[PDB]
């Protein structure tokens, strides 16, 4: 039961009428932010527009990433989701903009269905060109097959009387084992005999699996699932990630459009979330203007706890939240407010409860006072050491003396800075 | 022919195979017996890790396009490679362990 | 009781020898070579 | 078994030397000083032992040569084996072929591991008779074995795999063996004769064998068909994000079903004062997930410029990182603690001293660095066998001190010889006149 | 028969009980530096504890590199010595830290000694000795195989386990001409006798002679390698036509980031072997010359690495003063080394020479390269050696010898060195000309 | 020995051509051939009416 700074957020807790309550879904306060977030939730649920931009901005310890996780959880698993940090964009194998596009194409999902054809049964004979003979529980069929999977079977050390499993669509070959009809041939044979399969050798099934566009693009450009010697021999030659031409994206778009027009698939827009976007370079920032103003780009959400700052990559322009006005114009802004004392106390007690800790009311008052004095994250971090300190004295509850002892043991930012200022050698 | 291909290359210049053999020659009789386990060649390393690769290799690709696995090495029913070269490729490569 | 250098019987099977030596014949062929055995004189 | 060992700067410390009630003893297991810091370290050890808390960042701080690295080594030793502990220097993440964020992800994945146990079979006993019936220019082979223990015997006949396994690993009537059915591997268990008594017990033995694999290795093994070799050559990177979450779902399923358990670990970063602000921004988010380990960082730096920026911050870290982290302070030592440390070092260096020699060493270590004395003792005991006396006296350490220069002494020496020393501008008076 | 500013140093010239005389091992002056270096040499020879480091500081041309070379000579040809310069750490293939760590491991070597027992000679007859089958059977069941033996200075005859029947399946030498067998492991090895060289006018195999000495030999094999070679071979592939080997044959195997798990594995195997009593680890010494060229990242990684279990003893050289360490600008530090790194190692001080020391150095330089110099010319050489630099005077010897050779005189004269000094200019005169003129020179 | 392989006298059967002469414009000699040299000659067999250089230093053959 691992808990880490989250998992107490079970959703925005918004009413069906679009009015958020005070305490619900592991959330307290931020009524305006929650209402706007639910509005954006219904926006993406509409699945009619594309390339919309929302930025939420506020100081630290204001649950911005918590809000992003909340909207992601409220949307559910049907919609694709991919959290991101700004620093992850910079790579050495491919240019930054190409990685941005790669993450763009991974943020939209496609629900597809197809028929899987398989042939399974007992190995009867192997006549070279290649014809094979399969024996089932009741049926029996002979199959002519490509020499590639024949050689794969040879590599799979398939013997006589064995039972195998073949996927017709992909040519996947797998041997289940050998039939128990001829099993006790040896006293201590290493091969594990398995019972004969039941049913016809020919079988058809249906799947409903889901894929994203980036998966289709990388599958088309890079085949990395081969079985015969030529396949993996070729695919091991170029391990490095390369660029992806735009014409490949256009071809993939055409084929998925044909698939959905025929009526065996439908498109699912998704959400791309970039956290701490203040550090992004100017080139990526001006690339976002072109990337967003497109036809397929999904909605995007940004986070930045900044003010009058210079964006990285330049040295002149001072812009709010570290975002130049050009990207600001195509942006929606959500304001997050700092908390207050009673909300701090409620947060602390809720975090204690989700950590299954017993806390005495005076200890909660001390924790709230200290959190207002220094920060909420400080108290949230140090509550667990208080719990273990109480556990050392074999007490399941939290006492004020224990909290004071823990605060003595572990420092905060202001005390450490004050010690550093009066220090012998930059302690 | 005498003035073009009689002897033009066997005049050293760059190199000569006998010189390479004289240089790439070896003055060692036998050493590193513990090649056994001191070196532990990776061909033995992969098979020594059989159980973990059976118990851990789980993930599969989400999508794959057929006719590109074979086309990657430039051999298809309509390709630019030679007639017997394509078959000799895997005739030399199928025997690989 | 572990005497001697671990005696191991080397048996032949089964009572059918076109060449009388069951193991000396193959050793002789390897040492001399059937192709070169026609030039002995 | 133990590995090859040579005396290191931190070879004298084995465990935190704490108490069951989390109390710091003045001396316990090559350890001394910093009581409340050790109490906090034991608290963090209890945190990692708990296993239900993730993504916690703690920071140690203090002057140089204070024991922060010693404290980390001690807590790692006390935590013991079978729990993945990783120590990394800040400069190791600046790779010319790997993204810094990617390297941090690899470190985090290596930080924790998973423990899996499975039921295994084995057959072991005193082999009596071995018969092999292989055909020359035939089509088949056969084998018959007589295997006997102290309490029973049974006759078995082999097929193909165990036949070649027995032939390739030479077994005679005197050499005893273990064989697995599913593995098929044939392992020597030592000759009974031709030297041990006949093994006892039933031939069949069902046991379990455990295996610990760190999350990064499952992450890489599924990345590419040749990705297994990256465990050794390491020529991998930029593992697609569509593998990490698949692995996370798989291990979540493993935990849910219950046959596989996970062991969270500790990631220690030393001299973190040098790092790029992008690494700090990534760390800010890497702590807000349910698989992040307990991370402890060290820095002797005070207020300094943050690498990648121009402004100065306490300890050189951006304020957001301090906000989501805890600070542990370490204080300067004193004479008696220095004396105890030198005595411990001498004991583990099998070095004999004298009381006045120790007094002079403590005086030096209190007027100079502790490491200066910790190296002066080694050079003194090295000198000791020139006079063929198995002991160290005051004149020996005095001669060693005047033979090997000190940082302060060298600095004060260069104060008046800058003419003959290459200046920053490059000009230097090489000629005497 | 050639030298380059060195190779006249024959060790450190330290007597028993650690005392340095005046003229010995091509070394004169700086007694205490030699004493300290001998102390470090003894400490390394102890082979007990590792990880210690030491840096030595001084002016240019003070013999620091000479001291390091003398230490290397004193250690001998068994313990490895790895020369290096700060600039060589940089690369465009791997990280700098990877190069530093691999050099660290390259410093430390390992010696393995073992003995094998071998019977060899000439076999008069290769025929197994048949015997009755212990089990109810038929045919021929071999109980022993008699092997003839014939060697120079020793000849016997012996029999072996009939299991060698598969070993004798493929030798392709002759009917028992020259053989090689092992006692405990058995096996065979193709080794024809020289007595049949002339029976065939042509032959494509060089005939081998009969073994010389005892028919049975117990010969020992000693190999000295470093762990860097060990784990490079462990990581690097091998084999022939298999896919990985053929792929690597065209892969241009650039070194890349040897992982730490291979380091752990090789540590485990070498530890179990030294515990087995078959391997002996020999810690080495690693030299980083001109360390002021390093950077902050390398310094911090060095601080981390010197705390490791298998960190070899390293020696650092620099000639900077109140300089600013590279990478940063605010850190003013002696010799351009951050103070934290200074706190982790000792300092050895070197001092400039005098007129008499320079004169003796010039005398040694003249003597080593088989030259004759007149006393007046030698004194003059000392005069502008003190006036300008020692290295200029040392270099000027060869041109003076050439001018002497031009007029056919083995010795060297004063006017010869005057002409040589006129022809070849020192630094001060050159910069004087540079500052006087204004035609871009 | 350079350019002297004159004539091949194949034969009883098996390990044949065990002795063939060598020739130049000014020098001739008969040389006996063994099974190993028979195999060497088998690879890239020649009429031997030409002149071919073969390594007497236990190397290989080289067509001229
Ligand atoms: N309404 C809330 N309910 C529960 N937890 C909250 C709430 N608001 C903030 N938090 C906590 O505050 C922390 C700050 O969240 P995050 O946005 O990641 O950092 P910051 O606000 O500094 O950007 C989160 O760990 C979250 O658990
Ligand atoms: N209580 C202690 N017991 C033993 N050794 C100590 C103690 N405190 C400090 N030290 C020593 O001080 C030295 C410096 O500590 P370390 O943390 O490695 O460097 P720094 O303090 O500069 O980060 C260590 O080698 C350690 O052995
Ligand atoms: N005591 C000495 N004996 C012999 N040669 C010396 C001595 N001192 C200096 N040298 C000469 O000086 C040169 C080395 O100069 P060195 O002091 O290493 O320069 P740096 O100070 O730049 O390291 C060598 O070529 C050596 O011949
Ligand atoms: Mg946040
Ligand atoms: Mg430290
Ligand atoms: Mg020098």
For residue E24, give Cα distances in angstroms to E14, E27, E29, E393: 9, 5, 10, 22
Q: What are E119's strand-pairing partners?
A: E181, E216
* Method by which the coordinates were obtained: cryo-EM
For residue B92, give Cα distances in angstroms to A228, A307, B89, B97, E246: 14, 66, 6, 11, 12
Q: What are A27's strand-pairing partners?
A: A24
Q: The tokens of D254 are what? A: 């493993």
DSSP helix/strand/coil, D227: helix
Q: The tokens of E337 are what? A: 């080394």
Cβ atoms of E11 and E73 within 8 Å: the answer is yes
d(C-alpha A133, C-alpha A145), whole Å = 11
Q: What are D185's strand-pairing partners?
A: none
Ligand 4 mean position, distance from CA A412 (Å): 19
**Is the C-beta atom of E151 inside 6 A of ligand 3?**
no
Q: The tokens of E23 are what? A: 């003229």
d(C-alpha D255, C-alpha A363), whole Å = 35
The crossing angle, in degrees rounded to 10, of helices E31-46 and D394-403 is 110
Question: Around ion ligand 6, which residues have CB less than 5 A away?
Answer: E 64-65
Nearest neighbour of A234 by CB, restricted to B60, B65, B72: B72
Question: Does E184 lie at the interface with C, CB-CB under 8 angstroms?
Answer: no
For residue A274, give Cα distances in angstroms to A112, A278, B71, C30: 28, 10, 38, 74
Q: What is the DSSP string of A369-387?
A: HHHHHS-HHHHHHHHHHHH
Q: The tokens of A26 are what? A: 């592991």
- Enumerate residues 6 to 65 of chain B having a beta carbon within 8 A of any beta carbon in chain E: 31-34, 37-43
Q: Whose CA is nearest to atom 7 of ligand 1?
A: A63
Question: Does D132 lie at the interface with E, CB-CB under 8 angstroms?
Answer: no
d(C-alpha A175, C-alpha A160), whole Å = 12
Q: D interface mutation test: which of E164, E165, E257 has the most D CBs within 10 A?
A: E257
d(C-alpha E259, C-alpha E264), whole Å = 9
Dihedral (CA of A70, A76, A79, A83) sign: positive
Contacts of E201 in chain F (CB under 8 A): 31-32
Nearest in space to E260 (alpha carbons), one of E295, E205, E293, E308: E308
Instruction: State the CB neighbour count (10 A cutoff) for residue A310.
Output: 12
Nearest in space to D370 (alpha carbons), one of D38, D9, D5: D9
d(C-alpha D337, C-alpha D32), whole Å = 7
For residue E33, give Cα distances in angstroms to A309, D414, E336: 57, 17, 22
Q: Which residue has the tokens 């700098």?
A: E96
Contacts of F56 in chain E (CB under 8 A): 202
Ligand 5 mean position, distance from CA D64 (Å): 7
d(C-alpha A337, C-alpha A62), whole Å = 7
For residue D167, give Cα distances in angstroms to D162, D163, E414: 8, 6, 86
User: To what resolution in angstroms was this structure determined?
Assistant: 3.8
**Pairing relationship of beta strands E19-20 and E332-334 according to DSSP bridges:** unpaired
Q: What are E193's strand-pairing partners?
A: E208
Q: What are A117's strand-pairing partners?
A: A204
d(C-alpha E330, C-alpha E324), whole Å = 7
Q: How far apart are the first and last CA of chain E?
A: 39
Ligand 3 mean position, distance from CA E6 (Å): 8
For chain A, the residue count is 427
CB distance A225–B60 less than 8 Å?
yes
Cβ atoms of E39 and E33 within 8 Å: the answer is no
Q: Which residue has the tokens 């001109």?
A: E290
Dihedral (CA of A283, D281, D233, E288) sign: positive
Q: How far is CA B76 from the centre of its chain?
A: 22
Q: How far apart are the first and last CA of chain C?
A: 53
Q: The tokens of E73 are what? A: 């000579």
Looking at the complex, report in whole angstroms how far the Cα of residue A288 sits from the nearest Cα belonging to chain B.
Answer: 28
Cβ atoms of E257 and E289 within 8 Å: the answer is no
CB distance C36–F14 less than 8 Å?
yes
Nearest in space to E128 (alpha carbons), one of E144, E148, E141, E140: E144
Nearest in space to A304 (alpha carbons), one of A324, A284, A288: A324
DSSP helix/strand/coil, B72: coil
Nearest in space to E218 (alpha carbons), one of E115, E120, E114: E115
**What single-letter DSSP state applies at residue D329?**
E
Of 1.10.8.60, 2.60.120.10, 1.10.3720.10, 1.10.1040.10, the CATH number of D335-414 is 1.10.8.60
Rounded to 5 degrees, what are φ and ψ at E440?
65, 50
Cβ atoms of E355 and D401 within 8 Å: the answer is no
Q: What is the DSSP string of A331-357?
A: -EEEE-----HHHHHHHHHHHHHHTT-
d(C-alpha F9, C-alpha D99), whole Å = 72
Q: Which residue has the tokens 């050079």?
A: D379
* Virtual torsion, Cα D235, D238, D243, D244, nearest 10 deg: 110
Burial E176-203 (b: 16+ CB within 10 A, else e): bbbbebeeeeeebeebbbeeeeeeeeeb
**Pairing relationship of beta strands E109-121 and D326-329 according to DSSP bridges:** unpaired
d(C-alpha B63, C-alpha A55), whole Å = 33
**Pairing relationship of beta strands A271-275 and A299-303 according to DSSP bridges:** parallel
Cβ atoms of E266 and B45 within 8 Å: the answer is no
d(C-alpha D358, C-alpha D360), whole Å = 5
**What single-letter DSSP state applies at residue E295?**
-
Q: What number does CATH give the domain F1-64?
A: 2.40.50.360
**Pairing relationship of beta strands D294-299 and D266-270 according to DSSP bridges:** parallel
Nearest in space to C7 (alpha carbons), one of B84, A249, D5, D193: D193
For residue C9, give Cα distances in angstroms to A144, E158, E185: 50, 19, 18
Which run of H or of E encompasses E119? strand E109-121
Is residue A244 exposed (0-12), middle (13-18) or buried (19+ Cβ within 10 Å)?
Answer: buried
Rounded to 5 degrees, what are φ and ψ at E244?
-65, -40
d(C-alpha E57, C-alpha D330), whole Å = 33
- Enumerate residues 214 to 253 of chain D having a beta carbon within 8 A of any beta carbon in chain E: 229, 231-235
Q: The tokens of A91 are what? A: 């790579």
Looking at the complex, report in whole angstroms how far the Cα of residue D228 sits from the nearest Cα belonging to chain A.
Answer: 13
Question: Does E435 lie at the interface with D, CB-CB under 8 angstroms?
Answer: no
* Virtual torsion, Cα E275, E276, E279, E283, nearest 10 deg: 0
The crossing angle, in degrees rounded to 10, of helices E227-235 and E96-107 is 120
For chain E, the residue count is 441
Half-sphere exposure of D119 (CA within 13 A, CB side): 3
Contacts of E247 in chain A (CB under 8 A): 236-237
Ligand 3 mean position, distance from CA E65 (Å): 7
User: What ranges do the domains of chain F cover?
Assistant: 1-64
Nearest in space to C9 (alpha carbons), one of D136, E183, D156, E162: E162
Q: Which CATH class is domain D117-209?
A: mainly beta
Nearest in space to D400 (alpha carbons), one of E198, E433, E42: E42
- Interfacial residues of C (vs E; Cβ cutoff 8 Å): 5-15, 17, 21-24, 26-27, 30-31
d(C-alpha E390, C-alpha E363), whole Å = 12
Contacts of C36 in chain F (CB under 8 A): 14-15, 34-35
Instruction: Give the distance between the most distant pair of CA atoms in chain F.
Output: 33
């Amino acid at each position: 039961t691992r808990t880490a700074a989250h998992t107490h957020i079970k959703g925005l807790g918004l009413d069906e009428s679009g009015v958020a309550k005070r305490v619900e879904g592991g959330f307290v306060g931020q009524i305006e932010a929650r209402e706007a977030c639910g509005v954006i939730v219904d926006l993406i649920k509409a699945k009619k527009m594309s390339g919309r931009a929302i930025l939420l901005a506020g100081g630290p310890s204001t649950g911005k990433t918590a809000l992003a996780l909340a909207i992601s959880q409220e949307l559910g698993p049907k919609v694709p989701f991919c959290p991101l940090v700004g620093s992850e964009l910079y790579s050495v194998e491919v240019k930054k903009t190409e990685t941005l596009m790669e993450n763009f194409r991974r943020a939209i999902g496609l629900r597809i269905k197809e028929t899987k054809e398989v042939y399974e049964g007992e190995v009867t004979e192997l006549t070279p060109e290649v014809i094979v003979g399969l024996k089932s529980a009741k049926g029996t069929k002979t199959l002519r097959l490509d020499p590639t999977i024949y050689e794969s079977i040879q590599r799979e050390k398939v013997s006589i009387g064995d039972v195998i499993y073949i996927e017709a669509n992909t040519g996947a070959v797998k041997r289940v084992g050998r039939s128990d009809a001829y099993a006790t041939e040896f006293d201590l044979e290493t091969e594990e005999y398995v019972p004969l399969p039941k049913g016809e050798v020919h079988k058809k099934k249906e799947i409903v699996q889901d894929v994203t566009l980036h998966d289709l693009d990388v599958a088309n450009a890079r085949p990395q699932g081969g079985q015969d010697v030529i396949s993996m021999m070729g695919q091991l030659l170029k391990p490095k990630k390369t660029e992806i031409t735009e014409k490949l994206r256009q071809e993939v778009n055409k084929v998925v459009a044909k698939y959905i027009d025929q009526g065996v698939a439908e498109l699912i827009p998704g959400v791309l979330f970039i956290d701490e976007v203040n550090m992004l370079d100017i080139e990526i920032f001006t690339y976002l203007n072109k990337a967003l103003e497109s036809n397929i780009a999904p909605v995007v959400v940004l986070a930045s706890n900044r003010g009058m700052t210079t964006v990285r990559g330049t040295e002149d322009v001072i812009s709010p939240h570290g975002v130049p006005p050009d990207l600001i114009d195509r942006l929606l802004i959500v304001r997050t407010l700092p908390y207050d004392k009673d909300e701090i106390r409620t947060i602390i007690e809720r975090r204690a409860t989700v950590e299954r800790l017993q806390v005495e009311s005076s200890a909660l008052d001390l924790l709230a006072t200290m959190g207002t004095e220094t920060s909420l994250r400080y108290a949230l971090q140090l509550l667990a050491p208080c719990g273990i300190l109480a556990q050392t004295s074999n007490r399941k509850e939290i006492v004020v003396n224990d909290v004071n002892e823990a605060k003595l043991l572990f420092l905060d930012a202001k005390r450490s800075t004050k010690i550093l200022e009066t220090s012998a050698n930059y302690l | 022919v005498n003035k073009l291909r009689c002897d033009r290359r066997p005049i050293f210049g760059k190199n000569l195979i006998d010189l390479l053999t004289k240089d790439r020659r070896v003055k060692y009789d036998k050493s590193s017996i513990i090649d056994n386990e001191l070196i532990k060649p990776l061909q033995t390393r992969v098979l020594d890790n059989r159980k973990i690769i059976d118990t851990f290799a789980v993930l599969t690709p989400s999508a794959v396009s057929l006719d590109m696995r074979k086309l990657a090495l430039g051999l298809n029913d309509d390709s630019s490679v030679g007639e017997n070269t394509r078959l000799k490729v895997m005739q030399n490569c199928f025997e690989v362990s | 009781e572990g005497p001697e250098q671990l005696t191991s019987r080397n048996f032949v099977t089964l009572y059918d020898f076109p060449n009388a030596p069951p193991n000396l014949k193959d050793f002789n062929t390897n040492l001399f070579g059937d192709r070169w055995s026609y030039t002995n004189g | 078994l133990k590995s090859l060992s040579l005396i290191a700067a931190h070879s004298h410390i084995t465990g935190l030397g704490l108490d069951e009630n989390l109390q710091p003893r003045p001396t316990s297991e090559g350890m001394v000083g910093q009581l409340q810091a050790r109490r906090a370290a034991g608290v963090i050890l209890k945190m990692v032992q708990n296993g239900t808390i993730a993504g916690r960042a703690v920071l140690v701080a203090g002057p140089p040569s204070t024991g922060k690295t010693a404290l980390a080594m001690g807590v790692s030793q006390s935590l013991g084996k079978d729990v993945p502990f990783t120590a990394i220097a800040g400069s190791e993440i600046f790779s010319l072929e790997l993204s810094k964020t990617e390297a941090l992800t690899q470190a985090f994945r290596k930080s924790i591991g998973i423990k899996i146990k499975e039921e295994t079979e084995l057959i072991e006993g005193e082999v009596v008779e071995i018969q092999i019936d292989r055909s020359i220019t035939g089509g088949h082979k056969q084998g018959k074995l007589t295997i006997k223990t102290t309490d029973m015997e049974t006759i078995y006949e082999l097929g193909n795999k165990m036949i070649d396994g027995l032939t390739k690993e030479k077994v005679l009537a005197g050499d005893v063996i273990s064989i697995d059915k599913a593995s098929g591997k044939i392992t020597k268990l030592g000759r009974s004769f031709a030297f041990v008594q006949c093994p006892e017990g039933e031939l069949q033995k069902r046991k379990t064998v455990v295996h610990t694999v760190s999350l990064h290795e499952i992450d890489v093994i599924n990345s590419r068909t040749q990705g297994f070799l990256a465990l050794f050559t390491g020529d991998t990177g930029e593992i697609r994000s569509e593998v990490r979450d698949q692995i996370n779902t798989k291990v979540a399923e493993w935990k849910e079903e219950g046959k596989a358990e996970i062991v969270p670990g500790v990631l220690f970063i030393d001299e973190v004062h040098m790092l790029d602000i992008e690494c700090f921004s990534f760390i800010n988010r890497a702590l807000e997930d349910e698989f992040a380990p307990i991370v402890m960082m060290a820095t002797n730096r005070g207020v300094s410029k943050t690498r990648g920026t121009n402004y100065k911050s306490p300890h050189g870290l951006p304020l957001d990182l301090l906000d989501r982290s805890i600070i542990i302070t370490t204080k300067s030592y004193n004479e008696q603690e220095i004396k105890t440390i030198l005595s411990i070092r001498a004991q583990e260096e099998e070095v004999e001293l004298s009381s006045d020699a120790l007094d002079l060493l403590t005086k030096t270590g209190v007027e100079t660095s502790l490491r200066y004395s910790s190296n002066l003792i080694s050079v003194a005991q090295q000198i000791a066998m020139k006079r063929k006396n198995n002991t160290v006296e005051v004149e020996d350490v005095k001669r060693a001190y005047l033979l090997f220069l000190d940082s302060a002494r060298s600095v004060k020496y260069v104060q008046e010889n800058e003419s003959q020393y290459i200046d920053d501008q490059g000009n230097v008076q090489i000629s005497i006149a």
